[PDB]
């Protein structure tokens, strides 16, 4: 009942059509709710998911880790949470930590179990992760819009213009793999520009994303609509226009934790 997506070779998916590059790499519900998504990505075992808790509290901890073959869910492993709903609670190990709308969360190697919760049903917490293996602990922490430097790239003319905020990176804290961000396109702006997972969101239900995608010569794209994923792997290119602006959130794993 896990979720999971092999890797697929680029010959592979060359031929896939258009339900078939879904069905690998899009990620159609990201937030389910009172409950916790979860897909698993043979691509440097990535695992992706949403947690929007509402009436009750959502967990995960050692029912996950079973599914994992593991005691817990973080036994080998670091969580990279993002909050892109209301005001809201993650506890770590009896230990909680109030995050806000855009606030974050790294849980590092060894915590037990997280639980994940929102302080009004009204406009409840969307907990966006992004969980990956992890040989070492680090402390776990939680990262603010304060600390996070934004820097504004692009511009009007190539309709780029874009903040990129970097939460989780080596400059401002530590991590074995996981790395990621938080990048808004500026009004008026559509376009957005070692395995990657983009999420996209905070875009009206009407507007969606054309996610480009494949080899450089053998380019598709898979239409995004308003919070929704896509496995980007090694081998692909991450391109996106939308109809409208947009934000996303980026994470990466590979071989240098250099963005």
């Not at 670091?78 to 109030?98: F, K, M, R, S």
């Not at 804290?173 to 990657?196: D, K, V």
Request: hydrophobic content about 35%.
């Amino acid at each position: 009942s896990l979720d999971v997506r092999q890797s697929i070779h680029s010959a592979h998916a060359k031929t896939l059509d258009t339900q078939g590059l879904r069905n690998e790499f899009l990620v159609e519900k990201v937030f389910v709710a009172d409950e916790y998504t979860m897909v698993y990505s043979h691509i440097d075992r990535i695992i992706v998911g949403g947690i929007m808790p509402i009436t009750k509290t959502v967990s995960v901890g050692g029912e996950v880790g079973k599914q994992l073959g593991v005691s817990y869910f973080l036994e080998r492993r670091e969580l990279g949470v993002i909050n892109i709903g209301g005001a809201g609670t993650i506890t770590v190990d009896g230990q909680c930590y109030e995050i806000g709308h855009r606030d974050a969360l790294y849980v590092g190697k060894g915590a037990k179990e997280v639980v994940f919760a929102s302080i009004d049903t009204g406009t409840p917490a969307k907990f966006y992760y992004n969980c990956a293996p992890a040989h070492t602990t680090y402390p776990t922490k939680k990262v603010t819009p304060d600390e996070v430097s934004p820097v504004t790239l692009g511009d009007n003319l190539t309709s780029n213009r874009r903040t990129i905020n970097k939460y989780f990176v080596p400059d401002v804290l530590e991590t074995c793999q996981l790395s990621m961000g938080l990048t808004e396109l500026a009004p008026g702006n559509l376009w957005n520009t070692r395995m990657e997972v983009y999420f996209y969101f905070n875009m009206d239900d009407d507007a969606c994303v054309f996610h480009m995608m494949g080899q450089p010569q053998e380019t598709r794209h898979i239409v995004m609509h308003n919070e929704q994923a896509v496995i980007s792997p090694s081998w692909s290119i991450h391109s996106g226009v939308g109809t409208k602006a947009y934000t996303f959130i980026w994470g990466m794993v590979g071989e240098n934790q250099v963005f």
